[PDB]
Design a binder for this molecule. Structure first.
Ligand code: F43
Ligand code: F43
Ligand SMILES: C[C@@H](OP(=O)(O)O)[C@H](NC(=O)CCCCCCS)C(=O)O
Ligand SMILES: O=S(=O)(O)CCS
Ligand SMILES: O=S(=O)(O)CCS
Ligand SMILES: [Cl-]
Ligand SMILES: [K+]
Ligand SMILES: [K+]
Ligand SMILES: [K+]
Ligand SMILES: [K+]
Ligand SMILES: [Mg+2]
Ligand SMILES: [Mg+2]
Ligand SMILES: [Mg+2]
Ligand SMILES: [Mg+2]
Ligand SMILES: [Mg+2]
Ligand SMILES: [Mg+2]
Ligand SMILES: [Mg+2]
Ligand SMILES: [Mg+2]
Ligand SMILES: [Mg+2]
Ligand SMILES: [Mg+2]
Ligand SMILES: [Xe]
Ligand SMILES: [Xe]
Ligand SMILES: [Xe]
Ligand SMILES: [Xe]
Ligand SMILES: [Xe]
Ligand SMILES: [Xe]
Ligand SMILES: [Xe]
Lengths: 248, 547, 442, 547, 56
């Protein structure tokens, strides 16, 4: 698979995020309880609430497709569908909204990915969501300063940074500690206070952000300079136009 | 400097280029004069009615960032965004009322019935007499029966009937009080075009009372107009008050020579005539009167149409008719505040002017690829070079509509054809989405992914020149950040060409009228005046209510 | 035949049924089974006798929470269903030997009513099945119990609701899969205003059968809308064949190759692979480590792409057993494949556009709802010309119970009655057999 | 004596039995204070705007006869007809706005989504928190996003959400500020019926702002309601601000458990939901709140509904929505002024109870011929016995509607069934037409000649219980002097029976609210208050205007 | 031109709009092909034949 055209670092990073054979760099280690705490759908050690009975307790209709498509564990169990949502600063956050959705549906099964200017979301079975969330939080998908976990009040992707380089958060779920140089998540994605904050590590250096970012910018790599990437987008525009008319 | 630099400096402490600021220390809603007014109002309102209402402690705390003032484009008026909410802005409400309560009705079939079926003569003398009768009758007063109860003249003072005709001799014969003089309201070349389009036809511009339009709906307009036309025809031309021929006048006034502002809508968005969803983009461009005063600046003309359409289509139509609540004041403000779209569009006009000259570019995909790509990159680069600008138009959808509108309008400036301008609009979205790995909200580019393929399609519910498209075009029926910009793109090629109208010359003339309440020659100036609570609307009931 | 393409026809299991069938043997204009399904849909009505009886017993008629105290009528309709149904059949039918069908279900609680085709040969549209059925049962009930002139109007309200004060049969105790003609988004949309849940109800949640019925209905509408005329006819037939009829076993094989571990992305890679092998696409030129693909047959590339899109929905929403992600699959399958290949996505971006708003209007406050309440006549999902809704049907079919507004909630009456019709329950089996039987008459 | 004698004696110098009088010497319009005000206002209007307007010299000269005062029935208030024109009467406009801006929305599906799909708990405490959130949000204020701009709380002070439920224990656990207390608003027997109809269901009464309803249309209401319900559900129950489940709430609020006041209309009279034409007669009776305060006088209850319907259906709907101009004031006023219809209907009620006892008559044609014939003859004889009465209700259509309404309501009093009452209405017309060799205007008895045969028909677009019929019932869709009277006949048998409601118990409860601007318990008193310019409506823009 | 759309299209149609819609697109396409109307101008042929549909 080629995934995406272009000869810039951005284009390559976009290809890497989609390529399931590319190993996302692990930049931090997060405990399973911390993931459950960040998600905020249940308490650590709380039973998985069920939206419907287990699939084996149900008698699904004989259906060649059902028999050929292995359900994810959370669907077998009847888990609810919950979410994790990220905001990505346009100031060189490693992951961006379109990059996420494309990469999610290349990497993860049974994924409902949504892309917006200030938020990107995935909904799936709860227990499966937690393992996806661990990777999305531990790897280069996420930077503790230029990315934020936000179930609501996502304002900030387009705002200026604060004095510490942190992205704006109306609810301040992620607190930069000027005494230690590390970021802590005081509250959960929906904004509810946590009992024990979650260390999210040190923000990436400005130089490393540009190394890993997937956004084009004039003060980084400009999209207009990735001529081959622009050319494919124009090609798609032209071929779409000709197909819709189809009377040449 | 950039046309938006002034607004950015008056909005934030930092210089527009600065990349960092400080938050959380502004006091929340207390930073804002308007939010403070709202908090006190909610306290008085809740106490008075016995039910909690506006409460800043509900939900999340507004104002962790700067609550920005907005410059209304082409003005020096700065207001908080709440002052541009249509509910808080009487000028915006009156703009829609003046459209909703307007219908165009020919007199040509009617005069033929008079002479052919009734065997009576129609002359400029009888037309004037009819017009004096209909201006008594149209606001809701009687001309034939005894013991009729009528509307209070002061409550319906904004209702009247005027006529226009391309025949200068007939126009001079009619009392000027009832005449929209094409020669006096349009420059010479435009007036000659408009008069040639109308010829010997005689057309009424009917405006029913704002108070009725607000009590009832848009489908009321053409019916109300027809009743009083019919009553005045009975009176002025001395027919029997209800004979066979009376029906011919009603059919002609209600169907045969009537021009609605908007056509009715299908069931899922069930609505009668003269609602915003039925107004095609070409009509909206022609309702806006910038073309006849700013004709030497095609950017100004085009963007006044954008402001007209963005407010009506996004704030009132999509933001209330089709949804409601807080609504989409900001989705629309992006297209007519801070001089941002003006900067992007003047750049595109200049780029097209240096490379092709307006209207001299080939009307093909080569021109679309050239102009829309260059202007898109210019627009997006401003958001990157100025952090303040990006924080100002914080919504991806806002930036998409503004950048693509400049790209679309620019392409149409080059080709003189609105359809290639529309192709440029969609090309801008595809580039924008790829440059920043984001575009608008969850469902912003439904029409934009259908866009390219449907620009030049010819199939049943796909193919249509942009001027004929409107809020009911299938792809367009749902989403903010397009419809008002489409009206701009529709105007774009005609403004470059010097055309007197985009799609309908009768609609163009019908709003070149100094007796309208809203001044359609200066839409954005009017919005600013409403924001300052300096606009006096029609339709108020103060006269019939206690002090 | 106008076109030269032939296809190999496969069953729901994934077995070859007939080789090298002319494409137009699957055309709604030629296929006798499609004609039968479409005419059946036009003429079939479900009558809820229990509901009619309970409405009368309580005077709860004319819409939600509506009741007229003092109008109550205690009629044992379900107890006399056989006599009532027989009397109604005599009025519904044109002759004793025509194709009228009146069949009692649930011990007399419901009644499958199929109005004779003769009535529609001299009718402009389809409102005959609900109107003739309604008045026939109203009169049969009145005659069964000699309901008086003074009370009969309550029987009419119990059956057909607030019509004609309401435009719809508001509160009616009958059901059809078609909605009233006034609600069409445009002329020729009637076969599109069929809720996805109705299709999933009729196919009893069968993934491939739900896909087929939906594709049959959508693409037939494209013919009535004039979209499948002239330059575009072949595109729509290939889309019907490959996306909805599992032509050449492409959908089936793609799901087989990706069902265990697969994702939307892996299905894309295999589809792009299959297209190259079958000569549908070729490398047109190369950029730095990137290959731009071209094709001499857009319609065929689109059909291959339509097949993979269906397979990706089945793989993605199948693995989740939750329909909601189909709006995501419809979007990013097409987004990804365009930058994977340099070729336009399914329906030239129309599917992507429909997915954008479909996602929005199934995850926001502004309207829409769950995937099952959408349809080809829905303002949200009308934009792609047949290539999106059949995937929504396949996704809702794979749903294991994550939807509040499932077919059981909004189409229970359809689920009980329409599913009894063999052609509606397993359309793929009938359309394929019909295609084979006319394979040499095309 | 007769209830109309007082009104007649105050209208004329002569006694009500005098068959002769003198005309032409009254001064024309100069006899009337209101026409004098109008003439002077017309002069000021024309002077200011530069176009002639109201002019008493146009057409024929009003006031060759006495321009009558009208007593509003059940009051001692006397006003000129102009005071009861809906344009000049803020109470009449607010009555329609209060209906137009209301929708009923269940919380039962929503609460099921919360518990089954999201796996969260619903309690009276979570409901109260939700209700406090939605009362901030519904007038147009934000709860989630940063940098939202909002409606001015004082401009939308009339917008709120309440709930009701038949479960007294649940109701008492919800903050009473948000609760319509059925036990407090209804008498015991009616409250028990209503609570039994609702059971454990919980229903919201949403009222959007009058200023929005007047700016937009009735189809806005259920959409506006759904957006702010949706935002408050996001906030109060801490779901993702836009996830899959959010769509279930939108579908619930906009379709699955929404109850519109009016259904949309077909294309010839294209209109969205919550327009007068979609309001069935049974709803109209239930919106009127006379039933819960006047339940021991079935005549008063029925005629309060007639006044509600005659004003809404004839003056606003048929007289403006479907036509316009001077309109149909007097058509409607004949049914709620001078106590004329009251006299005729009280005679019929006494006749039925003396002969049958209310509701005790056989429900058959024998009762129809008996009661409708007797009441018709009584009513018509009053016009013959009192020339002043015949001159007061000078239009044949006025007299037909009043006489048939008394005959129809009286027949329903006897049978307890609205359908036989409707048959009596049509028989009254047939007898009336033959007695005086006249009935109404050219097209008045279209539905009346179709009437008899369609009363008991069961065919597709013919058969329907009267309670389910409305202004869109085919025969009824065009003509004055019927629809409001039909709503009365719908109420009449239920008023005689003591029923708490006519057709929908949720609609009945939804207007038994003190937070409404119009007092639906005293429709005719409100009309009188509006006539005197003592009614203060909502939706005014005075706060955002210079003066 | 008098046009009678074949009965076969209506046996597989729900109602009657195939007649104007099939005729319209057929004549739109035939005109475009007759004069090789360009992608950029063809939409005017569509407006000339079927009007403001689908905005109206
Ligand atoms: C709750 C939703 C889901 C939905 O269906 N609509 C919402 C909310 C809705 C509410 C918010 C009112 C409130 O706060 O109580 C209103 C005002 C509509 C209404 N009901 O009146 C609105 N959005 Ni939204 N909404 C907006 C926008 C946006 C932008 C905001 C991006 C950012 O970084 O701030 C994003 C979409 C995106 O990412 O592209 C967005 C999403 C969302 N929008 C997410 C909430 C996101 C969050 O948790 O903060 N809106 C905009 O992009 C600008 C215009 C702005 C609208 C108000 C106006 O036009 O003035 C408002 C339009
Ligand atoms: C011109 C028509 C034909 C038509 O289509 N409508 C008319 C006139 C129309 C106009 C009269 C306004 C004006 O005077 O300028 C209006 C007010 C409707 C409007 N356009 O606003 C109206 N009638 Ni008419 N119209 C009325 C009526 C009537 C009665 C009047 C009978 C009598 O002896 O005076 C007769 C019909 C009949 O004979 O039954 C009648 C006919 C007629 N009516 C004859 C004129 C008759 C004449 O030459 O005097 N109206 C009425 O019967 C009472 C209500 C009254 C309406 C105003 C109100 O409701 O307040 C008005 C309703
Ligand atoms: C989709 C449809 O909603 P339903 O699915 O019919 O409830 C439609 N709403 C809209 O299109 C909302 C448009 C305005 C709000 C979103 C702007 S991005 C309508 O109410 O008719
Ligand atoms: O988040 S959503 O895009 O659904 C709301 C856009 S206003
Ligand atoms: O004169 S008509 O009978 O036509 C009606 C007058 S309202
Ligand atoms: Cl099969
Ligand atoms: K707040
Ligand atoms: K007069
Ligand atoms: K209005
Ligand atoms: K394609
Ligand atoms: Mg060509
Ligand atoms: Mg600084
Ligand atoms: Mg500088
Ligand atoms: Mg609707
Ligand atoms: Mg140069
Ligand atoms: Mg061939
Ligand atoms: Mg099988
Ligand atoms: Mg592979
Ligand atoms: Mg006296
Ligand atoms: Mg006597
Ligand atoms: Xe112009
Ligand atoms: Xe049929
Ligand atoms: Xe019927
Ligand atoms: Xe094609
Ligand atoms: Xe569920
Ligand atoms: Xe009552
Ligand atoms: Xe067409």
């Amino acid at each position: 698979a080629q995934y995406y055209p272009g000869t810039t670092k951005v284009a390559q990073n976009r290809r890497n995020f989609c390529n399931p054979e590319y190993e996302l760099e692990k930049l931090r280690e997060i405990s399973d309880e911390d993931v459950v705490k960040i998600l905020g759908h249940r308490a650590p050690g709380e039973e998985y609430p069920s939206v419907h009975p287990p699939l084996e307790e149900m008698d699904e209709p004989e259906d060649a497709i059902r028999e050929m498509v292995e359900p994810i564990d959370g669907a077998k169990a009847g888990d609810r569908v919950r979410y994790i949502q990220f905001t990505d600063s346009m100031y060189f956050a490693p992951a961006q909204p379109y990059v996420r959705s494309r990469a999610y549906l290349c990497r993860y099964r049974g994924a409902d990915a949504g892309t917006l200017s200030g938020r990107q979301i995935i909904e799936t079975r709860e227990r499966d969501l937690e393992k996806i969330s661990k990777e999305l939080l531990e790897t280069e998908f996420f930077d503790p300063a230029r990315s934020g976990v936000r179930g609501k009040s996502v304002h900030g992707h387009s705002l200026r940074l604060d004095e510490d380089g942190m992205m704006f958060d109306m609810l301040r779920r992620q607190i930069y500690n000027k005494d230690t140089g590390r970021v802590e998540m005081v509250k959960n994605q929906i904004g509810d206070e946590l009992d024990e904050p979650v260390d999210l590590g040190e923000p990436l250096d400005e130089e490393t952000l540009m190394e890993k970012t997937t956004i084009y910018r004039v003060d980084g790599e400009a999209y207009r300079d990735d001529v081959e990437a622009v050319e494919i987008m124009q090609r798609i525009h032209v071929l779409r136009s000709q197909g819709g008319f189809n009377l040449e | 400097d950039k046309l938006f630099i002034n607004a950015l400096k008056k909005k934030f402490e930092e210089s527009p280029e600065e990349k960092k600021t400080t938050f959380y220390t502004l006091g929340g809603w207390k930073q804002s004069e308007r939010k403070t007014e709202f908090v006190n109002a909610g306290k008085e309102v809740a106490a008075k009615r016995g039910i909690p209402q506006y409460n800043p402690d509900i939900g999340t705390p507004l104002g962790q960032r700067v609550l920005m003032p907005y410059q209304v484009s082409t003005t020096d008026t700065y207001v908080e965004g709440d002052d541009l909410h249509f509910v808080n802005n009487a000028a915006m409400q009156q703009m829609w009322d003046d459209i909703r309560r307007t219908v165009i009705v020919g007199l040509n079939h009617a005069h033929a019935v008079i002479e052919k079926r009734l065997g009576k003569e129609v002359t400029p003398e009888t037309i004037t007499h009819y017009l004096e009768t209909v201006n008594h009758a149209m606001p809701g007063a009687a001309v034939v029966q005894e013991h009729m109860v009528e509307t209070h003249p002061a409550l319906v003072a904004d209702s009247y009937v005027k006529v226009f005709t391309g025949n200068d001799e007939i126009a001079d014969e009619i009392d000027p009080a009832f005449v929209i003089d094409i020669n006096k309201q349009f420059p010479e070349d435009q007036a000659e075009t408009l008069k040639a389009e109308v010829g010997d036809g005689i057309w009424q511009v009917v405006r029913i009372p704002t108070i009725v339009s607000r009590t009832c709906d848009g489908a009321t307009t053409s019916r109300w107009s027809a009743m009083q036309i019919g009553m005045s025809m009975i009176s002025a031309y001395k027919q029997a008050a209800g004979e066979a021929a009376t029906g011919d006048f009603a059919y002609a006034a209600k169907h045969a020579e009537v021009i609605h502002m908007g056509t009715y809508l299908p069931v899922r968005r069930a609505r009668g005539e003269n609602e915003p969803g039925g107004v095609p983009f070409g009509y909206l461009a022609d309702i806006c009167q910038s073309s006849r005063v700013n004709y030497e600046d095609p950017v100004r003309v085009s963007l006044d149409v954008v402001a007209t359409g963005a407010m009506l289509y996004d704030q009132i139509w999509l933001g209330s008719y089709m949804s409601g609540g807080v609504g989409f004041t900001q989705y629309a403000t992006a297209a007519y505040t801070d001089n941002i779209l003006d900067d992007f569009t003047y750049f595109g006009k200049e780029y097209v002017e240096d490379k092709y000259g307006l209207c001299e570019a080939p009307n093909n995909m080569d021109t679309v690829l050239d102009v829309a790509t260059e202007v898109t990159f210019y627009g997006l680069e401003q958001y990157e070079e100025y952090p303040a600008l990006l924080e100002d138009q914080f919504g991806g959808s806002q930036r998409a509509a503004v950048v693509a509108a400049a790209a679309g309008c620019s392409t149409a400036f080059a080709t003189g054809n609105a359809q290639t301008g529309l192709s440029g609009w969609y090309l801008s979205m595809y580039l924008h989405k790829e440059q920043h790995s984001r575009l608008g909200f969850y469902g912003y580019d439904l029409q934009d992914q259908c866009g390219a393929s449907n620009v030049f399609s010819i199939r049943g519910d796909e193919g249509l020149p942009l001027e004929l498209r409107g809020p009911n075009y299938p792809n367009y029926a749902m989403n903010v950040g397009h419809q008002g910009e489409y009206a701009g793109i529709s105007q774009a090629p005609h403004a470059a060409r010097g055309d007197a109208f985009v799609f309908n010359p009768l609609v163009k003339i019908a709003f070149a009228d100094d007796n309208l309440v809203f001044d359609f020659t200066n839409v954005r100036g009017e919005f600013a005046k409403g924001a300052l609570r300096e606009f006096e609307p029609a339709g108020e009931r103060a006269l019939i209510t206690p002090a | 035949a106008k076109f030269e393409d032939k296809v190999d026809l496969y069953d729901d299991r994934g077995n070859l049924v007939e080789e090298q069938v002319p494409l137009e043997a699957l055309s709604p204009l030629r296929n006798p089974a499609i004609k039968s399904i479409v005419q059946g849909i036009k003429r079939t009505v479900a009558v809820n006798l229990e509901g009619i009886e309970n409405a009368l017993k309580t005077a709860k008629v004319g819409g939600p929470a509506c009741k007229i105290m003092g109008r109550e009528l205690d009629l044992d309709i379900v107890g006399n269903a056989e006599s009532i149904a027989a009397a109604a059949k005599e009025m519904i039918q044109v002759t004793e030997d025509d194709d009228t069908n009146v069949e009692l279900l649930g011990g007399g609680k419901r009644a499958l009513v199929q109005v004779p085709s003769a009535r529609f040969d001299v009718a402009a549209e389809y409102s005959a099945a609900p109107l003739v059925t309604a008045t026939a049962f109203v009169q049969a009930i009145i005659n069964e119990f000699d309901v008086s002139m003074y009370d009969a109007n309550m029987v009419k309200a119990a059956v057909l609701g607030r019509y004609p004060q309401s435009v719809e049969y508001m509160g009616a105790n009958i059901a059809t899969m078609l909605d009233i003609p006034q609600k069409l988004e445009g002329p020729g949309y009637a076969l599109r205003n069929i809720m996805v849940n109705h299709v999933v109800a009729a196919t009893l949640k069968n993934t491939l059968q739900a896909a087929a019925l939906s594709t049959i209905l959508e693409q037939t509408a494209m013919f009535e809308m004039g979209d499948a005329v002239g330059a575009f006819e072949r595109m729509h037939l290939l889309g019907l064949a490959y996306q909805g009829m599992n032509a050449d076993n492409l959908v089936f094989d793609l799901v087989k190759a990706n069902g265990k571990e697969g994702t939307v992305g892996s299905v894309i890679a295999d589809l792009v692979e299959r297209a190259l092998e079958d000569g549908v696409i070729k490398v047109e030129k190369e950029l730095t480590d990137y290959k731009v693909y071209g094709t001499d047959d857009l319609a065929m590339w689109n059909a291959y792409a339509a097949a993979g899109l269906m397979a990706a929905t089945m793989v993605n929403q199948g693995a989740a057993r939750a329909a909601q992600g189909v709006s995501s699959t419809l979007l990013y399958y097409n987004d990804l494949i365009e930058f994977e290949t340099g070729l336009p996505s399914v329906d030239f971006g129309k599917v992507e556009g429909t997915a954008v708003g479909f996602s929005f209007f199934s995850h926001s406050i502004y309207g829409g709802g769950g995937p099952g309440i959408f349809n080809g006549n829905h303002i949200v999902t009308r934009h792609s010309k047949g290539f999106a809704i059949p995937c929504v049907a396949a996704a809702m079919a794979l749903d294991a119970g994550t939807q509040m507004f499932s077919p059981e909630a909004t189409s229970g009456l359809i689920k009980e009655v329409f599913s009894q019709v063999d052609e509606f329950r397993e359309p793929l089996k009938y359309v394929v057999e019909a295609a084979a039987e006319i394979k040499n008459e095309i």
